[PDB]
Amino acid sequence: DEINEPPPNICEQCLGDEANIRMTKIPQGSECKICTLPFTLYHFKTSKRSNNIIKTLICVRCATQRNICQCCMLDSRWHIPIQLRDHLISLVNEENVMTEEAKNDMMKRFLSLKNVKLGGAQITSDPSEADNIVDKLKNILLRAYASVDISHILKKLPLNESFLKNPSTKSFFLYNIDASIPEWKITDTVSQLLGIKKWKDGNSLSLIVNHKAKCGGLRFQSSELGERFVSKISETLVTPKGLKRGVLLIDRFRIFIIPWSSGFSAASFGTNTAENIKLSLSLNKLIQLELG
Amino acid sequence: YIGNLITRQFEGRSNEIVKTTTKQRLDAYYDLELRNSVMDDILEMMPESIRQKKARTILQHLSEAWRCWKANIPWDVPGMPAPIKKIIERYIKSKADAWVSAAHYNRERIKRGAHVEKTMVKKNLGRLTRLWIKNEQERQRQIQK
Amino acid sequence: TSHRPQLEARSGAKAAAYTPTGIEHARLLPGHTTLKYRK
Amino acid sequence: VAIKKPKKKYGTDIDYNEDIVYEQAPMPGIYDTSTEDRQIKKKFEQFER
RNA sequence: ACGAAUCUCUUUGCCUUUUGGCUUAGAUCAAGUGUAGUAUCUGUUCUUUUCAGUGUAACAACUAAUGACCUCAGAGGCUC
Numbered sequence: 379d380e381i382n383e384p385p386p387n388i389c390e391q392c393l394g395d396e397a398n399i400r401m402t403k404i405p406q407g408s409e410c411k412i413c414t415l416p417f418t419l420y421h422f423k424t425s426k427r428s429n430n431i432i433k434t435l436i437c438v439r440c441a442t443q444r445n446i447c448q449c450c451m452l453d454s455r456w457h458i459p460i461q462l463r464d465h466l467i468s469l470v471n472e473e474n475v476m477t478e479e480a481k482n483d484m485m486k487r488f489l490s491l492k493n494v495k496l497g498g499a500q501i502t503s504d505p506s507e508a509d510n511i512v513d514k515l516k517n518i519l520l521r522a523y524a525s526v527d528i529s530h531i532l533k534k535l536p537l538n539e540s541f542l543k544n545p546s547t548k549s550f551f552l553y554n555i556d557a558s559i560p561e562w563k564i565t566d567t568v569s570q571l572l573g574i575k576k577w578k579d580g581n582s583l584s585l586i587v588n589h590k591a592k593c594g595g596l597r598f599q600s601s602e603l604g605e606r607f608v609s610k611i612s613e614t615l616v617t618p619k620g621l622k623r624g625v626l627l628i629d630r631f632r633i634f635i636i637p638w639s640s641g642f643s644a645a646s647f648g649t650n651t652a653e654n655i656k657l658s659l660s661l662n663k664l665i666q667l668e669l670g
Numbered sequence: 671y672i673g674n675l676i677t678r679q680f681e682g683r684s685n686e687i688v689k690t691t692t693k694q695r696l697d698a699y700y701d702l703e704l705r706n707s708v709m710d711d712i713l714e715m716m717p718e719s720i721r722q723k724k725a726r727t728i729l730q731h732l733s734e735a736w737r738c739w740k741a742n743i744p745w746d747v748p749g750m751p752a753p754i755k756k757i758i759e760r761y762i763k764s765k766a767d768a769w770v771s772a773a774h775y776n777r778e779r780i781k782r783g784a785h786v787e788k789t790m791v792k793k794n795l796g797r798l799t800r801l802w803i804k805n806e807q808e809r810q811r812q813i814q815k
Numbered sequence: 816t817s818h819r820p821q822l823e824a825r826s827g828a829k830a831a832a833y834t835p836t837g838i839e840h841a842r843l844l845p846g847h848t849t850l851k852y853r854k
Numbered sequence: 855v856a857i858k859k860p861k862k863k864y865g866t867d868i869d870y871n872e873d874i875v876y877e878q879a880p881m882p883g884i885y886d887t888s889t890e891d892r893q894i895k896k897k898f899e900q901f902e903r
Numbered sequence: 904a905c906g907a908a909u910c911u912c913u914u915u916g917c918c919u920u921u922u923g924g925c926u927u928a929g930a931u932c933a934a935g936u937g938u939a940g941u942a943u944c945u946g947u948u949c950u951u952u953u954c955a956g957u958g959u960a961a962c963a964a965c966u967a968a969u970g971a972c973c974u975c976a977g978a979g980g981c982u983c
């Protein structure tokens with residue numbers, strides 16, 4: 379029906395805070411992002427003096443089948459993305475719900491003209507069928523390489539020196555880094571410790587972490603920061619031979635440090651992926667030798 | 671003229687092109703309507719259990735019998751059901767009237783000399799010589815009887 | 816083969832779901848624009 | 855090296871392998887085909903395994 | 904001459920890979936002698952190439968790159 383068409387589905391947070399919004403209707407505007415088929419393009423601005431036009435990117439049929447708005451394509455209730463919506467319902471019904479989309483232009487147009495709901499769009503747009511699953515979300519919250527010749531590399535890693543105040547170095551050697559714990563999280567924890575925040579402007583610290591070798595190093599400019607990095611770390615572990623090592627403390631993780639006393643560079647950790655895995659396998663013993 | 675050209679550039683040709691009947695495709699379209707009408711009437715006669723295979727073979731007898739009428743050969747199929755043979759003979763005589771009256775109408779055009787196609791002269795030449803020998807064979811049988 | 820009869824005709828169900836073009840034909844121009852009503 | 859696909863001869867040409875091209879779902883009936891679909895998905899993943 | 908089920912077999916039924924348009928059958932049904940064009944092979948000609956300047960003596964450059972160590976935030980110095 380070209381003379382009887384639904385009103386558009388737009389979020390409240392796309393429309394924003396103001397009361398009256400002048401919206402422009404173009405009866406066959408752009409074509410839909412999803413079904414590649416033309417529709418009534420609505421576009422508007424939040425305020426009069428704004429500088430960003432907010433367009434409706436998809437048609438109302440693709441917006442109804444997913445239960446999303448046309449502008450930001452987030453869900454109409456819960457205001458979350460579709461990939462996260464179908465994952466949260468998957469933990470409640472214990473089965474995979476998923477809206478699947480055709481890669482084929484004759485099967486993008488076919489899938490839009492049917493009057494079904496897709497994915498979590500049966501659960502959402504029914505308020506009774508959505509609130510009880512939020513209650514079922516609440517009970518979930520009540521639960522709350524032996525052949526490698528690695529010996530050329532381990533001479534350059536320190537592994538035998540202590541974390542004292544007295545050496546004045548720029549570089550350090552961070553080992554026991556998990557395959558999680560992203561490179562930004564270690565620079566933010568050090569910069570929170572020194573108060574040298576927005577460090578990327580002045581380039582106060584430079585950090586290299588491999589994530590295969592489970593090891594890394596962080597370089598400082600201006601060596602007087604090195605005594606600030608030593609003195610602001612209180613907790614240390616002493617190996618039962620000696621040779622105390624400081625612990626950086628990312629949440630639930632422990633990262634050991636030794637002053638390198640030279641610049642490690644890239645490729646100190648490894649020059650091949652198969653080669654770097656054995657250095658993590660080399661270290662895992664020394665961590666167990668350091669602790670136990 | 672250009673407004674159709676430019677929209678064909680921007681939008682492309684419509685996929686719903688429906689060809690009108692014309693002098694060149696009249697004889698083909700006359701056959702499509704004729705096979706459909708014979709197909710419908712025979713399929714009602716059939717008590718049950720007739721598919722796309724049995725409807726495909728019966729439309730042969732129609733094509734064969736039209737050749738036999740053009741040949742003036744009498745068309746008899748042994749074992750042919752008499753209702754269906756009654757149907758097929760009817761539509762041939764329907765087609766025979768259009769075949770004969772178009773042959774008369776075009777001779778009146780050619781004698782006037784008013785715009786007959788070069789192919790249409792040869793076709794009308796071939797239609798008459800069927801009719802003249804068919805009239806000859808009728809006259810031979812009336813003398814014999 | 817390649818020269819066949821028809822098993823079914825081209826249906827108008829297929830052309831109804833297409834998008835139109837709006838090309839302007841010569842015979843669809845406005846003509847006889849007033850209807851005549853009987854007494 | 856992966857197998858090359860046959861190229862699109864026209865614009866809306868269809869890769870039949872990528873998707874169910876005209877999926878007409880079975881009409882919803884009253885007999886609750888829930889556990890049967892699990893046994894298919896287990897058997898279909900077992901077959902491709 | 905009737906067994907409760909398997910295999911092998913005959914006959915009815917079912918026909919299963921079991922003739923998918925039209926018109927003027929859609930239209931027509933091959934050289935004895937005397938000379939040319941195209942392709943390939945064979946032969947001939949032309950075109951597509953550059954540097955060297957013997958021997959002896961003296962002087963200069965080359966056989967920049969690689970490996971290792973150190974400083975600075977890749978370069979600089981040293982040795983092989």
Ligand SMILES: [Zn+2]
Pocket residue numbers: 410411412413414415436437438439440441490
């Ligand atoms: Zn759409």
Ligand SMILES: [Zn+2]
Pocket residue numbers: 388389390391392447448449450451452
């Ligand atoms: Zn939105």
